[PDB]
Design an enzyme around this catalytic site. Structure first.
Site, mmCIF file in Angstrom:
data_model
loop_
_atom_site.group_PDB
_atom_site.id
_atom_site.type_symbol
_atom_site.label_atom_id
_atom_site.label_comp_id
_atom_site.label_asym_id
_atom_site.label_seq_id
_atom_site.Cartn_x
_atom_site.Cartn_y
_atom_site.Cartn_z
ATOM 1 N N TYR A 57 0.868 -1.180 0.000
ATOM 2 C CA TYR A 57 0.000 0.000 0.000
ATOM 3 C C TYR A 57 0.900 1.223 0.000
ATOM 4 O O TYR A 57 1.637 1.457 0.962
ATOM 5 C CB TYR A 57 -0.927 0.003 1.208
ATOM 6 C CG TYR A 57 -1.960 1.090 1.182
ATOM 7 C CD1 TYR A 57 -2.691 1.349 0.029
ATOM 8 C CD2 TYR A 57 -2.221 1.850 2.311
ATOM 9 C CE1 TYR A 57 -3.640 2.343 -0.003
ATOM 10 C CE2 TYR A 57 -3.165 2.839 2.288
ATOM 11 C CZ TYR A 57 -3.874 3.085 1.124
ATOM 12 O OH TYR A 57 -4.830 4.079 1.081
ATOM 13 N N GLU A 59 0.411 4.890 -0.380
ATOM 14 C CA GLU A 59 -0.470 6.046 -0.490
ATOM 15 C C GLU A 59 0.340 7.302 -0.806
ATOM 16 O O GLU A 59 1.126 7.770 0.024
ATOM 17 C CB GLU A 59 -1.245 6.196 0.812
ATOM 18 C CG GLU A 59 -2.283 7.277 0.812
ATOM 19 C CD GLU A 59 -3.448 6.923 1.700
ATOM 20 O OE1 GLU A 59 -3.467 5.779 2.208
ATOM 21 O OE2 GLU A 59 -4.336 7.781 1.896
ATOM 22 N N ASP A 184 -8.009 12.581 -25.482
ATOM 23 C CA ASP A 184 -8.095 11.197 -25.023
ATOM 24 C C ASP A 184 -7.748 10.337 -26.231
ATOM 25 O O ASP A 184 -8.594 10.091 -27.094
ATOM 26 C CB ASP A 184 -9.485 10.875 -24.466
ATOM 27 C CG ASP A 184 -9.623 9.418 -23.992
ATOM 28 O OD1 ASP A 184 -8.600 8.745 -23.753
ATOM 29 O OD2 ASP A 184 -10.768 8.928 -23.873
ATOM 30 N N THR A 210 -5.995 4.706 -22.084
ATOM 31 C CA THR A 210 -5.885 3.343 -21.582
ATOM 32 C C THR A 210 -4.497 2.778 -21.883
ATOM 33 O O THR A 210 -3.861 3.112 -22.895
ATOM 34 C CB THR A 210 -6.927 2.443 -22.234
ATOM 35 O OG1 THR A 210 -6.814 2.542 -23.667
ATOM 36 C CG2 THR A 210 -8.325 2.837 -21.791
ATOM 37 N N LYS A 213 -5.886 -1.960 -25.175
ATOM 38 C CA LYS A 213 -6.278 -1.603 -26.558
ATOM 39 C C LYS A 213 -5.018 -1.580 -27.427
ATOM 40 O O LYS A 213 -4.223 -2.525 -27.346
ATOM 41 C CB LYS A 213 -7.088 -0.307 -26.547
ATOM 42 C CG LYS A 213 -8.306 -0.333 -25.625
ATOM 43 C CD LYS A 213 -8.993 1.037 -25.680
ATOM 44 C CE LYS A 213 -10.214 1.147 -24.787
ATOM 45 N NZ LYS A 213 -10.757 2.531 -24.976
ATOM 46 N N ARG A 219 -5.105 -3.511 -18.412
ATOM 47 C CA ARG A 219 -6.290 -2.649 -18.354
ATOM 48 C C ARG A 219 -6.073 -1.586 -17.293
ATOM 49 O O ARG A 219 -6.194 -1.866 -16.094
ATOM 50 C CB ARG A 219 -7.566 -3.407 -18.021
ATOM 51 C CG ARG A 219 -7.835 -4.683 -18.751
ATOM 52 C CD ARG A 219 -9.336 -4.973 -18.678
ATOM 53 N NE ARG A 219 -9.994 -4.156 -19.673
ATOM 54 C CZ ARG A 219 -10.184 -4.563 -20.918
ATOM 55 N NH1 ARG A 219 -9.800 -5.789 -21.270
ATOM 56 N NH2 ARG A 219 -10.761 -3.756 -21.803
#
Length: 401
Positions: A57, A59, A184, A210, A213, A219
């Site tokens: 983790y 953060e 985008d 992304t 693709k 992903r």
């Protein structure tokens, strides 16, 4: 006492799940997938997602985290960022977005306010669109809209556009009214990373994508921008803590892998075949009496129009899917059928190119598609195309056993 972790696979622990995973993988092996937004990423990408980095983790951002012990996840996040920068020639990159949604949203969160005006394509939204005349963008219709509405953000980025987006035309249109230019490039990013398609990264103020693709990674989502002290500060905070908690360090290692891959000559050759395969298919469909929006393609996808054939996009979707060919119904410029029915399908070649389909394979595949649609989904036609599909898939496996 309780058990410690051993080397216990999904098969040995959870046969019910292992069977379902296996059915999916064989289905994927035995199906031609022409959904323009779909790819198969490398064994190395999957290995990073499967890594133990899921257990950290972290953060925050590198060198300015909240909890300590991030000596090596700092290096991994920074590696992904620097590779992202080197790949797309960006001066800022955020690799923490969990998805494309979480990346786009954070752009709006960092750049807009209650009820600002945005000019984009189908908060106070205003649309713009494609001149069905050209099948391409009506840049004069975009031009007049910005001057008349004075949006604070023009958004450029498309999911069914087969031509090159004139990023520079959008820039000066957004400079005359002072708007932000936000791009985008999720659908063309692989093509952009190999250099087979012009790069908006240095042009727009903020570019997202992304990593899957055409980029063929995991992903996930990514943000880039041209150097801009104030903007770079916002994008940071909009991602975390605006939209997210901690990042997924294992997906971030997978991003770094895929960025290194997309830097290779082999990746440029892959994107160049992706384009030639799409051009090849569009030629077959035209020679078979079909329409293609804007008359062809310059990238990895096009829209096959079905009006002259008097078949709906839903119908053609089903027939082809029944033949193990996978597309999606898509509406065409000024489509006279409703959005839930449409008069077209969207076909993309990134996936079939990845399993080694060449021009000869896709010209035949287009012939089989035209065979199904012409026949109005005849059962014997679909039966024969299914058998042909399943055999070419066996000859071109995605992953090597």
């Amino acid at each position: 006492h309780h058990h410690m972790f051993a080397n216990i696979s999904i098969s040995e622990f959870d046969p019910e799940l292992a069977q379902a995973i296996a059915s999916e993988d064989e289905r994927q092996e035995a199906h031609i997938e022409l959904i323009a937004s779909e790819n198969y990423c490398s064994p190395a990408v999957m290995e990073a997602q499967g890594s133990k980095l899921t257990n950290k983790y972290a953060e925050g951002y590198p060198g300015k985290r909240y909890y300590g012990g991030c000596e090596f996840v700092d290096v991994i996040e920074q590696m992904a960022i620097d590779r992202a920068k080197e790949l797309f020639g960006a001066d800022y990159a955020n690799v923490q977005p969990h998805a494309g949604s979480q990346a786009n949203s954070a752009v709006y969160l960092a750049l807009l306010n209650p009820g600002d005006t945005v000019l984009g394509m189908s908060y106070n939204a205003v649309q713009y669109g494609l001149n069905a005349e050209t099948g391409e963008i009506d840049y004069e219709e975009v031009e007049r809209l910005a001057l008349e509405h004075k949006p604070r953000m023009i958004v450029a980025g498309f999911s069914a556009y087969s031509r090159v987006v004139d990023w520079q035309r959008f820039r000066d249109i957004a400079d005359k009214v002072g708007a932000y230019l936000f791009v985008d490039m999720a659908h063309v990013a692989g093509l952009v990373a190999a250099g087979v398609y012009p790069n908006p990264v240095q042009i727009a103020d903020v570019t997202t994508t992304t990593t899957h693709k055409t980029l063929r990674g995991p992903r996930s989502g990514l943000i880039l921008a041209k150097a801009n002290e104030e903007i770079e500060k916002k994008l940071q905070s909009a991602v975390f803590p605006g939209n997210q908690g901690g990042p997924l360090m294992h997906a971030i290692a997978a991003k770094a892998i895929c960025f290194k891959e997309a830097m290779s000559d082999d990746f440029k050759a892959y994107q160049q075949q992706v384009v030639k395969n799409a051009q090849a298919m569009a030629e077959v469909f035209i020679a078979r009496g079909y329409d293609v929006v804007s008359g062809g393609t310059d990238n990895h996808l096009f829209l096959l129009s079905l009006i002259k054939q008097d078949v709906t996009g839903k119908d053609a979707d089903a027939w082809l899917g029944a033949a193990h060919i996978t597309v999606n119904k898509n509406s065409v410029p000024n489509d006279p059928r409703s959005p839930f029915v449409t008069s077209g399908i969207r076909i993309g070649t990134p996936a079939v190119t990845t399993r080694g389909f060449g021009e000869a394979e896709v010209r035949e595949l287009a012939g089989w598609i035209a065979d199904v649609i012409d026949s109005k989904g005849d059962e014997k036609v679909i039966a024969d195309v299914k058998a042909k599909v399943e055999a070419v898939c066996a000859k071109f496996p995605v992953y090597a056993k």
